């Protein structure tokens, strides 16, 4: 609900990205704040939550999406982003 | 009509994606909720329905579209997406 | 004028796509309803008409555009798309 | 001024496309009606004019742009596009 | 706060770009002014600050993001951009 | 200020493009009128000025940006574009 850690998975294609998003949100209490079409085929899903939650989420999403479609590019956690980085992070996705 | 399972096919190009969409919707009672241009040439079609419907649909779409154009990237089902994932799923496509 | 069959050609680049569109529309009575920039360099042109018209059109467009530029990716006909698929098909192109 | 033939050059990148556009418009009396970013790096420039004008233009643009940057993909003329194809052709570019 | 030097990192994918942005902003007093989706999968993050700040920032971001996802494309500093270049530089990002 | 020659550099990525823009504007009296994301990763920067200015600018930008990131695709000058080509040239960039 109120944690500020950031979890991020980037995939080749939207399908593995949606699998990642589902596995992450089912794995721990994290909020899905963005899904971004990057260009070139990259898609990135972003979650916010407490450190431990985001840790468990990212690990789960990564294990899940590497088997789907063109797969996984990156799985990363930043437990406390600098206040400046909030300027580039999505507050809610657009669907 | 009211099922919440999710079916997804991602293709290289729009043509196999439209074949996928037609085969899926003809294969079982599923609703076509989105067609997404991902970037890089990826296109993803998304269907919602009951679990068994989405199962049959995805299987049909996958068999159909792998023979068309540049073909199939991914075919996947999530029978119950986390409530958070609804935030990134299209409610209706844009044409 | 009133036929609901669907003809589709996908090309690498816009130029072969315009050649495809011209050959298809000159080959039989079909309506050009969409030209779509897919991402990655894919372009897809879509025609509607009666079954026989769309058959002749797609065959003509395919023979024509494979010799132009980066060429042909896919040529496909769906003689009756499921009512659900109409949700993703363009009603008129944008130029 | 009033001719309806269509000249088209597709290039890898915008720079050779601008060279193409300049060579075509300097080579014969043709009107520059569109420059289109296709995705994947393809750019297409479109000219309208009388048949002979468009013939000379396309030949000139093609010779000119193949030496610039990533070069030429396609050079093509359609002397009379079907009335349906007008629906997908740009009336004026956007800059 | 008031320095006009420019720091820039370009990455393959958004995830390494967000890592870059975090490392740069944590490394020295710089302002994150832009994150740009370039097409093809390139993402570029831009920081402004005093010369020494931007120097330290870019070095930190570069060391950080080369280990994340598809990695680093470019890391560059322009300590005083020409007044003309301000016309193409983002004033604040969009998230 | 009032010259109509055109200088153009196309790069793989935005970073070398910004280096190009800075080197060109510092090298001679030219105005930066556009920076264009082309798709596929191509970026093109456009300068206007007198012939000699644009000559010196393009040469400087080219030497500068080939060492940055994924580098240089094309460097080109058109000393007097046809009046028709003005229709596709940017009047000012968007940042």
E36 contacts E92 by C-beta, under 8 angstroms:
no
Query: Any idea what DSSP says for residue C71?
Result: -
Q: What are the counts of helices (DSSP H) followed by strands (DSSP E) for chain F?
A: 2, 4
How far A76 CA sits from the closest chain B CA (Å)? Answer: 19
- Contact yes or no for F37 and E41 at CB 8 A: no
Element (H, E) at C64: helix C51-65
F69 contacts F13 by C-beta, under 8 angstroms:
yes
How far C33 CA sits from the closest chain D CA (Å)? Answer: 8
Rounded to whole angstroms, the Cα distance separating D34 from D21 reads: 10
Rounded to an integer, what is the distance from CA C38 to the centroid of its chain?
Answer: 14
Query: Which residues, at least 6 apart from C22, have a Cβ–Cβ distance to it below 8 Å?
Result: C64, D78, D81, D82, D85
Q: Residue A28: phi, psi to the nearest 5?
A: -165, 170
- Contact yes or no for E95 and A88 at CB 8 A: yes
Task: Kindly provide the resolution of this structure in angstroms, with one decimal.
Answer: 1.6
DSSP string, D2-45: ---EEEEEEEESHHHHHHHHHHHHHHSSEEEEEEEEEETTEEEE
Kindly state the tokens that stand for B60: 């049909």
How far F45 CA sits from the closest chain E CA (Å)? Answer: 9
Going by C-alpha positions, the residue among C61, C3, C66 that lies closest to residue C35 is: C61
CA dist A70 → B60, B88, E11, F37 (Å): 20, 20, 20, 26
F74 contacts D16 by C-beta, under 8 angstroms:
yes
Q: Tokens 């831009």 — which residue?
A: E46
Q: Which chains touch C (3 or more CB pairs under 8 A)?
A: B, D
Sheet architecture: strand order including E5-12: E30-39, E42-49, E5-12, E72-78
- Three-class secondary structure of residue B74 per DSSP: strand
- Contact yes or no for F30 and E84 at CB 8 A: yes
* Closest-approach residue (CA) in chain C for B69: C74
Q: Tokens 């260009």 — which residue?
A: A39
Rounded to whole angstroms, the Cα distance separating C66 from E66 reads: 42
- Angle formed by the axes of helices F51-65 and F14-27, nearest 10°: 140
Rounded to whole angstroms, the Cα distance separating F58 from F64 reads: 10
F6 contacts F24 by C-beta, under 8 angstroms:
no
Going by C-alpha positions, the residue among F90, F5, F2 that lies closest to residue F54 is: F5
Q: Which chains touch B (3 or more CB pairs under 8 A)?
A: A, C
Helix ranges (H only) for chain A are: 14-27, 51-65
The domain ranges of chain B are 1-87
Give the technique used to solve this structure: X-ray
Q: Which residues of A3-32 are buried (b: 16+ CB within 10 A; e: fewer)?
A: bebbbbbbbbbbbbbbbbbbbbbbbbebbb
Of F12, F15, F21, the CB nearest to E85: F21
Going by C-alpha positions, the residue among F72, F93, F90, F70 that lies closest to residue F81 is: F90
Rounded to an integer, what is the distance from CA B90 to the centroid of its chain?
Answer: 11
CATH superfamily of this structure's domain D1-87? BMC (bacterial microcompartment) domain (3.30.70.1710)
Number of other CB atoms surrounding residue A83 within 10 Å = 9
CA dist E10 → B38, C23, E34 (Å): 21, 43, 12
């Amino acid at each position: 609900v109120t944690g500020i850690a950031l979890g991020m998975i980037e995939t080749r294609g939207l399908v593995p990205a949606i699998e990642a998003a589902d596995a992450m949100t089912k794995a721990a209490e994290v909020r899905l704040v963005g899904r971004q079409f990057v260009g070139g085929g990259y898609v990135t899903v972003l979650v916010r939550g407490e450190t431990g939650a985001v840790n468990a989420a990212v690990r789960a999403g990564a294990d899940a999406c590497e088997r789907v479609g063109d797969g996984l590019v990156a799985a990363h956690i930043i437990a406390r982003v600098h206040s400046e980085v909030e300027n580039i992070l999505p507050k809610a996705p657009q669907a």
